[PDB]
Design a protein around this ligand. Structure first.
Ligand code: CQ8
Length: 339
């Protein structure tokens, strides 16, 4: 078998001529030539079986990606693994080869308003499908948005995803959270477990702001610093928005802060399209119940050149204590169709 950067990458003979791409959340990713489809593809090597948590994340990523079928969601083309559970130590996920990701593009390229509009449309179109399956992505960020040479955008990594559960969303103040800090909604730090669709809309709002300026809008250095940044731009929450927070520790923390005024979007982004800023404001709304939903966002005037609900499909059917041995068996069963 071909070896890449001191490690086995056992994908042959269908996939040959390997080249290192980089490290992702699951391990090494390479490009390879697919001798059947006559194109180069991406292959991610995953070695999760020694840890229950790695098994849970890998199973979620595979189960969700195989059930979903949408132009703006990365697909799984093939899955390579040993023929028996005993011999299975790694799993390789084959996906379409992308040219870049939005994180890398934002680091070096200025986006035209036309590119911002197109990218936002595609993120929201993919998100409508995810939310229609009652699934929350929970880790939307520029590095999870991959792009091909013609700027077709694919949402990636469903490892932190969950089925929406609005009834069990409430929790205490400063409750630990897994998802990427800069893209976390204010309620995560206050009273939310991140089990409602509004969590994803906030992250999209953060990505739109970052597309407008090439810099993260709320670059918090640690857990509570994240809320300082959000309130530094949005200003103090209204009495009505505080009344929606019943938890005393969270509400009292907010009441203890000096009054802060809103920084206007047009002063932060003087070159931005005014319709883009109006949609940004609706996505970056402090109160999650007043925050715009994905289908409303698609219908916003900023996206009128693309909006077509008949061409924004939904899922046909909607969608933690298991030991790692049981999870390995489920991963083996979930990947059986490619043998
Ligand atoms: C969600 N992120 C990943 O899956 C990932 C992370 C680090 C390195 C590669 C990654 N995957 C891909 C990478 C590419 N192409 C690269 C994209 C970045 O720029 C170089 C090509 N094509 C398809 C895929 Cl699946």
């Amino acid at each position: 078998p071909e070896m890449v950067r001191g490690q086995v990458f056992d994908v042959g003979p269908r996939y040959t001529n390997l080249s290192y791409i980089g490290e992702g959340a699951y391990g090494m990713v390479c490009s390879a030539y697919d001798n059947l489809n006559k194109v180069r593809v991406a292959i991610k090597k995953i070695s999760p079986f020694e840890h229950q948590t790695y098994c849970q994340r890998t199973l979620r990523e595979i189960k969700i990606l195989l059930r979903f079928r949408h132009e703006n969601i990365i697909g799984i083309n093939d899955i390579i693994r040993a023929p028996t559970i005993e011999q299975m130590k790694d799993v390789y996920i084959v996906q379409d080869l992308m040219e870049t990701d939005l994180y890398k593009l934002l680091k070096t390229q200025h986006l035209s308003n036309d590119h911002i509009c197109y990218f936002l449309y595609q993120i929201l179109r993919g998100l409508k499908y995810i939310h229609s399956a009652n699934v929350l992505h929970r880790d939307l960020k520029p590095s999870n948005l991959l792009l091909n040479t013609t700027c077709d955008l694919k949402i990636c990594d469903f490892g932190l995803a969950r089925v929406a559960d609005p009834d069990h969303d409430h929790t205490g103040f400063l409750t630990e959270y897994v998802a990427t800090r800069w893209y976390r909604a204010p309620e995560i730090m206050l009273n939310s477990k991140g089990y409602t669709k509004s969590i994803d809309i906030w992250s999209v709002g953060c990505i739109l702001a970052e597309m407008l300026s090439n810099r993260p809008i709320f670059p918090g250095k640690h857990y509570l610093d994240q809320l300082n940044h959000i309130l530094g731009i949005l200003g103090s929450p209204s009495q009505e928005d505080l009344n929606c927070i019943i938890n005393l520790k969270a509400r009292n923390y907010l009441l203890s802060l000096p009054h802060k005024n809103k920084v206007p979007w047009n002063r932060l982004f003087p070159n931005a399209d005014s319709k883009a800023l109006d949609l940004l404001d609706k996505m970056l709304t402090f109160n999650p119940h007043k925050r715009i939903e994905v289908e409303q966002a698609l219908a916003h005037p900023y996206l009128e050149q693309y909006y077509d609900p008949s061409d924004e499909p939904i899922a046909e059917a909607p969608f933690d204590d298991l030991p790692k041995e049981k999870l390995k068996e489920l991963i083996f069963e979930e990947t059986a169709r490619f043998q």
